[PDB]
Ligand binder design. Sequence first.
Ligand code: NA
Lengths: 115, 115
Amino acid sequence: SMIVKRGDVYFADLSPVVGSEQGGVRPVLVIQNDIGNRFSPTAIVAAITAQIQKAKLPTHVEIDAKRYGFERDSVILLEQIRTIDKQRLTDKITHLDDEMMDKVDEALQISLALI
Amino acid sequence: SMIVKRGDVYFADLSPVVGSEQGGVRPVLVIQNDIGNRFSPTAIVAAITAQIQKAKLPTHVEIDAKRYGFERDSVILLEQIRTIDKQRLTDKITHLDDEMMDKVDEALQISLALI
RNA sequence: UUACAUAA
Ligand code: NA
């Protein structure tokens, strides 16, 4: 399988889904550790949306599109995470810096009560 | 949406899946924080399996069925996470104690590179 | 009447 790295953002097809799950083709952020990312057929990712541009919850991290290379201002949803097989991935969009990933890590810890 | 709690174990159908995403009806462990569990229509869960013969990865936590009231000795796969609509949850099996959840937390931190 | 894969 393709190698990916924590911090990578890829388009992925998350369909089909049930109820309030996030579906469709959308950007996703790789949040699995890099050992699994190297050896496993699967990655763990967080959904990104543009339906909001500002964080509503402490599990949200805003992405400034111009700074980070996105089409529009988006938000990473650390309450919407899932293990996906790498075949769902298509094109790599970008790789987020440490400033962003530190915010992602805090949001993930809150999301999963690891605080 | 129904109230669930971190530490709860429910059956859920994780299918349909692609590739090596954990599929089928199986127990899942709620790992989302309880504020999210109260206010959101989705729950973040980890898949559980009974294939205890596979090599134990650092993202795996073993469940002794006699102690914890399961049908057979099982393994919590913290590399297999899903955010699912609560309507997927069916029968409640049990609620895991703090000793078990401390091991889950450690494995989750390894899975998501939050060590 | 409830997987496979994945950690030098
Ligand atoms: Na693909």
